[PDB]
Amino acid sequence: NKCDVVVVGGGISGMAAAKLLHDSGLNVVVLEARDRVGGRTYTLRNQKVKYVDLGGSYVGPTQNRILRLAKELGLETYKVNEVERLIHHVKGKSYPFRGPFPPVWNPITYLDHNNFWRTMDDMGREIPSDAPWKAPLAEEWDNMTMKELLDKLCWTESAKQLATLFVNLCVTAETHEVSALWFLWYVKQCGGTTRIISTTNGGQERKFVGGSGQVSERIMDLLGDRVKLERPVIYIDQTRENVLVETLNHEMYEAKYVISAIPPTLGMKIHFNPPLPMMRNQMITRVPLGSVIKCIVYYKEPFWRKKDYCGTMIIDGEEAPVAYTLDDTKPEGNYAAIMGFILAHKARKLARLTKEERLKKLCELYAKVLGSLEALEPVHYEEKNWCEEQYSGGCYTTYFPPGILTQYGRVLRQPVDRIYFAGTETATHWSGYMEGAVEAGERAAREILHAMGKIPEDEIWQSEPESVDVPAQPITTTFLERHLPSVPGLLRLI
């Protein structure tokens, strides 16, 4: 019944918040709707796969909070395989390459591609990470979709196809679904185009040995019986001295403060007394999550490596079910596997099929792209469609349709009386990722410590020392990349 703080949600953010408060000497309780912890992370274990991340998996340089938390819990990382060549498959042909950038051979098309990525980062430099609505052109950019921006910027269909894939893969949503301002903020707050797309020296550099689900699991181990599973919160009452929190299974909890560590829209599943302020009331109806099926096909051997391919495939176009893959083989070289994402509208379309039907489509696609009949002989298959999850709403994260971020963005982390807001969606660096989940959970926890008079105001937001295990190398550009003209810039010189 009685405690200092109730945390709603036992994903990484809620767990990180509860741990910090617990370590500080407060009595905490975590109320989790599911029969498991981890939320948008989920590590499946069976003999065929050993373990596999069906939700969030990747960590990399500059994500120092998640790396520090995992290390403390006794976890280690290994590198996602990028020794051999990456593949860009365009108009029915595979083009192997090295470096983070797919090569472009046509000179006009080259200028167009170069300008697109450069312009994304140029625009990002004017968007504050902690307040994107304060961008000088916030309203102009928020009132446009990414489709509109791409249509204006890309003079070649080639650039437009890759730019579209980029949007789809970053935020599991269609270019026409999302605000340009929000999307440009999203990329900038991960460190820019190069950092977000990169395996080596980027967001996809590493995975956790044994799976990312261990983060939430091991914190639940540390919290004893303070984690309550199968307790979906249904009601929060702030009319009295202590806050009252009621669960679906009829239990009542009493606390001084609450942390909401669930996706913003899932706040709708809770009935509030008194009602929420107008702006939050409407905000939580305006913020959907994206759509994705994560699919892992297993093979006897990582056969692609013999052809000097690392397993990374970037696959343009409408026909392909999967637009992007990475090698999911274990560090020992066993449990050979390819991870692929079925993105946005394709998640919706292909959900109608059977598991076996999807397996066949993926195997035939991979056989074409890798140029190998070995892709047609899988030994095992696992997948998860995150669109079906009542207590997630989708994956990877929440996207903002046009007009929403400028009108409602401010209220995302604004406290409501004694309710404070965590969740990766409220982070200012790697929001959308496990890193942002840690940042937001610890910040929300420290807001409460400050409310209790335990720490000063300047300690609410705290820097993180760089990981020694996963250090970051700087992102560089070339002289030509910085100074080559766009297509219309070349036209104006003519």
Ligand X SMILES: CCc1ccc(CCOc2ccc(C[C@H]3SC(=O)NC3=O)cc2)nc1
Residues making contact with its own copies (CB under 8 A): 143-145, 147-148, 174, 176-177, 232, 234-235, 248, 250, 265-266, 268-269, 271-272, 275-279, 281-282, 285-289, 291, 345, 348, 351, 385, 387-390, 393-394, 401-404, 407
Residue 39: which of its own copies, ligand FAD, ligand X, none does it interact with, CB under 5 to 8 A by kind?
ligand FAD
Site residues (CB under 6 A) for ligand X, limited to 52-81: 58
- Helix, strand, coil proportions of the chain in percent (round to 5)? 35, 20, 45
For position 265 contacting ligand FAD by CB under 6 A, the verdict is no
Residue 13: which of ligand X, ligand FAD, its own copies, none does it interact with, CB under 5 to 8 A by kind?
ligand FAD
For position 233 contacting ligand FAD by CB under 6 A, the verdict is yes
Q: Which two tokens stand for residue 138?
A: 């916030």
Separation in Å, CA 180 to CA 127, 132, 143, 177, 263: 12, 11, 8, 10, 21
Residue 185: which of its own copies, ligand X, ligand FAD, none does it interact with, CB under 5 to 8 A by kind?
none
Rounded-to-integer distance, Cα 494 and Cα 492, Å: 5
Q: Which stretch binds ligand FAD (CB under 6 A): 100-108, 118-126, 146-154, 266-274?
A: 266-274
Nearest to 420 by CA among 5, 20, 56: 5
For position 97 contacting ligand X by CB under 6 A, the verdict is no
Instruction: Tell me the closest approach of the beta carbon of residue 57 to ligand FAD, in angstroms.
Output: 4
How many residues line the site for ligand X (CB under 6 A)?
15
Instruction: Tell me the closest approach of the beta carbon of residue 13 to ligand FAD, in angstroms.
Output: 3
Q: Helix (H, G, I), strand (E, B), or coil: what is residue 313?
A: strand
Nearest to 425 by CA among 446, 447, 397: 397
| H/E stretch holding 194 | helix 193-197
Cβ–Cβ under 8 Å, residues 315 and 365: yes
Separation in Å, CA 269 to CA 6, 203, 239, 296: 17, 32, 19, 32
Choosing from 102, 128, 210, 371, the residue that interacts with ligand X (CB under 6 A) is 102
Instruction: Tell me the closest approach of the beta carbon of residue 263 to its own copies, in angstroms.
Output: 9
Cβ–Cβ under 8 Å, residues 394 and 386: yes
For position 198 contacting ligand FAD by CB under 6 A, the verdict is no
For position 270 contacting ligand X by CB under 6 A, the verdict is no
Separation in Å, CA 293 to CA 133, 140, 348, 452: 31, 33, 9, 43
Task: Output 199 or 467, the one with its CB closest to ligand X.
Answer: 199
Residue 373: which of its own copies, ligand FAD, ligand X, none does it interact with, CB under 5 to 8 A by kind?
none
Residue that is written with structure tokens 């599973």 in the block: 229
For position 196 contacting ligand X by CB under 6 A, the verdict is yes
Cβ–Cβ under 8 Å, residues 29 and 278: no
Q: Beta-carbon neighbour count of residue 411 at 10 Å?
A: 19
Task: Output 117 or 335, the one with its CB closest to ligand X.
Answer: 117
For position 100 contacting ligand X by CB under 6 A, the verdict is yes
CA-based torsion, 221, 385, 63, 413: positive or negative: negative
Choosing from 44, 169, 234, 367, the residue that interacts with ligand X (CB under 6 A) is 169
For position 433 contacting ligand FAD by CB under 6 A, the verdict is yes
Cβ–Cβ under 8 Å, residues 99 and 475: no
Instruction: Tell me the closest approach of the beta carbon of residue 349 to ligand X, in angstroms.
Output: 20
For position 10 contacting ligand FAD by CB under 6 A, the verdict is yes
Q: Which two tokens stand for residue 124?
A: 């990002």
Residue 144: which of ligand FAD, its own copies, ligand X, none does it interact with, CB under 5 to 8 A by kind?
its own copies
Helix ranges, 228-283 (H): 278-283
- Using CB under 6 A as the criterion, which residues of the chain lie in contact with ligand FAD when the complex forms? 8-14, 31-34, 39-41, 55-58, 232-233, 261-263, 266, 269-270, 292, 294, 386, 391-392, 395-397, 423-424, 432-435, 437
**Interface with ligand X (CB under 6 A):** 58, 100-102, 117, 162, 166, 169-170, 193, 196-197, 203-204, 314
